[PDB]
C-alpha cells in the first residue's frame, strides 16, 4: 500500500523515538566518530592491514554477519575465514593496542546513532528540491547519501554545530543526482547551469517585448559568445524526447512508432543490387593481373581505403602504373559488355 508514508513514518518511528540533544549527545557521538578513524588509522599501522580492511571487518562485527558480505559484493574475501581471522589478530593485540579495537568498534557504533537522528533533517530539506524530476523518495535517498558524506567530514573540535554542517553536503548530493539523473540523454553540469539561464532569460524577454523573442533578443540578453545559431541550437537539446509510443492522427489505435521508417535494412531492390554489383564486379575482377588489382580491390573492398604504404613490396610508381592502367582497361572491357553502366546504385 503506497510507499512514501511508510518511510516518512518509519523515519519518525525511530526519529520520534530517537531524537538527539541539540548539543551534548551530538558532540558525544562526534568525538566517538573521529576517535574512530584515528583509532583505525593506528590499527592499520600496528597491523600492516589496509584501512579499507579494518573499516569493513569492524563494520560487519556490528552491522551484519557473513550474509551481507556475500550477495552485495561477491566472495573476494572469505565470508567466514578471512573476517574472523582478521578479528583474531585485533583481539590478540596487547592491551595498549587492543584499546583501539574497542574504540574503533565503539566508534562505528556512534556513527550509527548519528546518521539516523537526522534522517528527517534530510526529509525537511528535500521537501524543497522537489518537482525537478525525481520521486520524493529518491530526492530523500540522495539526500542521505549526503548526510553520511557529511559525517565523515565533521570536526567536532571546531565548535560550530552539526545539523547545519549537514545542510550543505546534503544539498550538494541532491543536486548532483538531479543534474545527473534528471533526463534520459546525459547533459553536462556545464550545459545545465546554462540552460536555466536561457529558460530564465526567456521570461525576462516575455516580460517586456510581447513577441516571443527571436534567437536574437535572447542571444543579446544572455551574454558574450551567444549568437543566433547558438540559442536555436541550445534549445533543441534543452528539449525532451517524445515517447516513441504516443497517440497519432485521429488517435484511437494507430500507434506513433509505426509511422517511423527504417534505413539500416536494405529494402529488396537494394539487397538485389549488392547481388548484381558483387558478382559483376567479381567477374570483372578476374579479367585482371591480380598483382595490383587485388590490392586496391581489398583496399576499398576488404579493409579500408593512402597510396604510399599501399603495396606490399614494389614501390609507388608501379602502383599507379598497373592501377591507372588496369582500372582503365577494366573500364573499357566493360564499356563493351555494359554491365555496370546503368549504375547499380
Between residue 129 and residue 148, which ones bind another protein under the rule CB under 8 A? Answer: 135, 137-138, 140-142, 144-145, 148
Binding mask 20-59 for another protein (x = CB under 8 A): -x-------------------------------------x
- Please give the size of the binding site for another protein, defined by CB under 8 A: 73
Which amino acids are annotated as binding site, given as ranges?
A: 76, 92, 219, 223, 226, 250, 253, 339, 342
119: number of CA atoms within 13 Å, CB side? 20
**Cβ-proximal residues to 269 (8 Å cutoff; 6+ apart), any chain:** none
Between residue 194 and residue 233, which ones bind another protein under the rule CB under 8 A? Answer: none
Q: Give pairs for 60-64: CB < 8 Å, separation 24+.
A: 61/87, 61/105, 62/105, 62/108, 62/109, 62/112
Between residue 69 and residue 128, which ones bind another protein under the rule CB under 8 A? Answer: 71-73, 87, 91, 99, 101-102, 105-106, 108-109, 111-112, 115-116, 119
182 touches another protein (CB under 8 A): no
Select the residue interacting with another protein from 131, 268, 309, 313 (CB under 8 A). Answer: 268
Q: How is residue 313 written as a grid cell?
A: 613490396
Select the residue interacting with another protein from 129, 165, 215, 256 (CB under 8 A). Answer: 256
Stretch that binds another protein, among 7-15, 209-217, 222-230, 288-296 (CB under 8 A): 7-15
Residues 99, 100, 101: CA angle, nearest 5 degrees: 95
181 touches another protein (CB under 8 A): yes
- State the Cα torsion 317-322-323-326 to the nearest 10°: 160
68 touches another protein (CB under 8 A): yes
Q: Assign 219 to helix, strand or coil.
A: helix
Look at phi and psi of residue 265 and say left if phi exceeds 0, alpha if psi is from -120 to 50, else beta. Answer: beta
**Cβ-proximal residues to 214 (8 Å cutoff; 6+ apart), any chain:** 228
Other CB atoms within 10 Å distance of the CB of residue 272: 12
239 touches another protein (CB under 8 A): yes
Give the nearest distance from C-beta 164 to another protein in angstroms: 20
Q: How is residue 151 written as a grid cell?
A: 559525517
Stretch that binds another protein, among 38-46, 199-207, 301-309, 324-332 (CB under 8 A): 301-309
Select the residue interacting with another protein from 131, 261, 309, 313 (CB under 8 A). Answer: 261
Amino acid at each position: 500500500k503506497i510507499s512514501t508514508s511508510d518511510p516518512v513514518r518509519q523515519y519518525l518511528h525511530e526519529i520520534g523515538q530517537v531524537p538527539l540533544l541539540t548539543l551534548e549527545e551530538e558532540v558525544e557521538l562526534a568525538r566517538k566518530v573521529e576517535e574512530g578513524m584515528e583509532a583505525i588509522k593506528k590499527l592499520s599501522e600496528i597491523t600492516g592491514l589496509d584501512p579499507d580492511l579494518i573499516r569493513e571487518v569492524v563494520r560487519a562485527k556490528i552491522l551484519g554477519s557473513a550474509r551481507v558480505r556475500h550477495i552485495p559484493g561477491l566472495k573476494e574475501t572469505l565470508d567466514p575465514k578471512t573476517v574472523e581471522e582478521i578479528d583474531q589478530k585485533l583481539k590478540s593485540l596487547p592491551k595498549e593496542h587492543k584499546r583501539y579495537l574497542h574504540i574503533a568498534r565503539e566508534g562505528e557504533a556512534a556513527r550509527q546513532h548519528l546518521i539516523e537522528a537526522n534522517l528527517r533533517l534530510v526529509v525537511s530539506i528535500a521537501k524543497k528540491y522537489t518537482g525537478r524530476g525525481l520521486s520524493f523518495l529518491d530526492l530523500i535517498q540522495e539526500g542521505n547519501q549526503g548526510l553520511i558524506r557529511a559525517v565523515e567530514k565533521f570536526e567536532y573540535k571546531r565548535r560550530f554545530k552539526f545539523s547545519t554542517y549537514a545542510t550543505w553536503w546534503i544539498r550538494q548530493a541532491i543536486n548532483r543526482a538531479i543534474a545527473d539523473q534528471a533526463r534520459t540523454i546525459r547533459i553536462p553540469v556545464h550545459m545545465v547551469e546554462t540552460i536555466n539561464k536561457l529558460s530564465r532569460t526567456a521570461r525576462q524577454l516575455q516580460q517586456e517585448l510581447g513577441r516571443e523573442p527571436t534567437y536574437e533578443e535572447i542571444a543579446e540578453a544572455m551574454g558574450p559568445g551567444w549568437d543566433a545559431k547558438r540559442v536555436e541550437e541550445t534549445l533543441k537539446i534543452a528539449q525532451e524526447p517524445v515517447s516513441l509510443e504516443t497517440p497519432i492522427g485521429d488517435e484511437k489505435d494507430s500507434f506513433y512508432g509505426d509511422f517511423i521508417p527504417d534505413e539500416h535494412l536494405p529494402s529488396p531492390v537494394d539487397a538485389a543490387t549488392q547481388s548484381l554489383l558483387s558478382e559483376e564486379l567479381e567477374k570483372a575482377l578476374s579479367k585482371l593481373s591480380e598483382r595490383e588489382a587485388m590490392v586496391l580491390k581489398l583496399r576499398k573492398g576488404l579493409i579500408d581505403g593512402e597510396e604510399v604504404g599501399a603495396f606490399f613490396g614494389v614501390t609507388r610508381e608501379r602502383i599507379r602504373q598497373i592501377e591507372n592502367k588496369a582500372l582503365r582497361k577494366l573500364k573499357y572491357h566493360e564499356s563493351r559488355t555494359r554491365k555496370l553502366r546503368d549504375f547499380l546504385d
